[PDB]
């Protein structure tokens, strides 16, 4: 099967520099034109870049040229993207995707790397709980950290139905900021146990927090 | 460049149903270089038509395309459950490629009402200078709801975030999580703190409040 796996991405400073890269397989990789595309935070997508499959050719859209640099090492199977002079605009999902060779259009992609340009430094959360008072409501709130992403999970994966965890919040201070709750019943509040399993693997921030009824 | 305008940004439709998009481009698209992609959420996009009409390799039967010029149109003959998705135009043709905002096509079903539950600041944030409330709208359809803070009677603006799951595949509901971000020195000149919540399922707005400093 064709697989295009993506890597490189990260939190970069403006000014700074990224490469990513692409790892091609199931495929004869040097027989086919190859793409990057950016699909900024909750927007639509947009080309990037593109190479020949000999790499003779390059291709950049205005908004990245001379800063942005295609290229393949046919010999590795793999696709590049080097990012110079880094904008707090380039902040997107970046997707290696690859050429029809025959009709010309976009016929495979791969799943995408979140790529974060910002001066602030990476930040764990400090995680609050969010205490219950037929059907109760209980959950954890993961609040100020950078960047994306963070885990939560709930009494170690087992406990999976009710759970809802919510997309994160950029707050004005440049933070994220999420909630995940879970629905119980009111009668389990008294015996069972409830902790959230929360990870953010940036700042290496690993979070066990039990949430109790508050008298 | 070329601009796709897709329509509707949103269809709530039910499996077994037939699904209509469209997509309009600024200026006539090249030789029908126009294609379809489908995208599920935190993953990659999917071929599903090249060159306006043709089906990609292993896209089933009920996925067809038409159209040339300036008017394109997707039709899905009869929605399966896997089809509920965001769907993109693209035009290649003239270069750069470019993407419509895309369609989101979502499953309809009976009006559900939120559960409505509010959750007070933890003592362990108020020691850092800031408190957040919670407000949470749990398993409702359709996904449009109104949320109103309010601070003693005193409505609140400018000071609150919200973000929404994707639509449950279990029950085909939407969640939303509201907070209200204040200083703990505002937090502490107030005693009830209220969560107002408007929604199509319910006849009249539903309030859940706490009074701070109250067990
Ligand atoms: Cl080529």
């Known amino acids: 099967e064709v697989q295009l796996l993506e890597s490189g991405g990260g939190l970069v400073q403006p000014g700074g520099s990224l490469r990513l890269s692409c790892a091609a397989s199931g495929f004869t990789f040097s027989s086919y034109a190859m793409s990057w595309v950016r699909q900024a935070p909750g927007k639509g997508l947009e080309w990037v870049s593109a190479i020949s499959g000999s790499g003779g050719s390059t291709y950049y859209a205005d908004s990245v040229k001379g800063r942005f640099t295609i290229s393949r090492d046919n010999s590795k199977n793999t696709l590049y993207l080097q990012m110079n002079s880094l904008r707090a605009e380039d902040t997107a999902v970046y997707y290696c995707?690859?050429?029809?060779?025959?009709?010309?259009?976009?016929?495979?992609w791969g799943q995408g790397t979140l790529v974060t340009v910002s001066s602030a430094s990476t930040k764990g959360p400090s995680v609050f709980p969010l205490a219950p008072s037929g059907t109760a409501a209980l959950g954890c709130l993961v609040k100020d950290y950078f960047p994306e992403p963070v885990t939560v999970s709930w009494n170690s994966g087992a406990l999976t139905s009710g759970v809802h965890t919510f997309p994160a919040v950029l707050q004005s201070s440049g933070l994220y900021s999420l909630s995940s709750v879970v629905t119980v019943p009111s009668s389990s509040l008294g015996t069972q146990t409830y902790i959230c399993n929360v990870n953010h693997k940036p700042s290496n921030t690993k979070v066990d927090k039990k949430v109790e009824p508050k008298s | 460049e070329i601009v796709l305008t897709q329509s509707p940004g949103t269809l709530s439709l039910s499996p077994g149903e037939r699904a209509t998009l469209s997509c309009r481009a600024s200026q006539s698209v090249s030789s029908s270089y126009l294609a379809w992609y489908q995208q599920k959420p935190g993953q990659a996009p999917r071929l599903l038509i090249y060159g306006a009409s043709s089906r990609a390799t292993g896209i089933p039967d009920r996925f067809s395309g038409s159209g040339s010029g300036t008017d394109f149109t997707l039709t899905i003959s009869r929605l399966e459950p896997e089809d509920f998705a965001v769907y993109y135009c693209?035009?290649?043709?003239?270069?750069?490629?470019?993407f419509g905002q895309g369609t989101k096509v979502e499953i309809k079903r009976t009006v559900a009402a939120p559960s409505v539950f509010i959750f007070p600041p933890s003592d362990e944030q108020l020691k850092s200078g800031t408190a957040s409330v919670v407000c949470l709208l749990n398993n409702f359809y359709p996904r449009e709801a109104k949320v109103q803070w309010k601070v003693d009677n005193a409505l609140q603006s400018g000071n609150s975030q919200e973000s929404v799951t994707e639509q449950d595949s279990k029950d085909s509901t939407y969640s939303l999580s509201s907070t209200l971000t204040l200083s703990k020195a505002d937090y502490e000149k107030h005693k009830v703190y209220a969560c107002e919540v408007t929604h199509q399922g319910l006849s009249s707005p539903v309030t859940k409040s706490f009074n701070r400093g109250e067990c």
């Open positions: 693209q035009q290649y043709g003239s270069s750069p490629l470019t």
């Open positions: 995707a690859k050429y029809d060779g025959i009709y010309g259009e976009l016929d495979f």
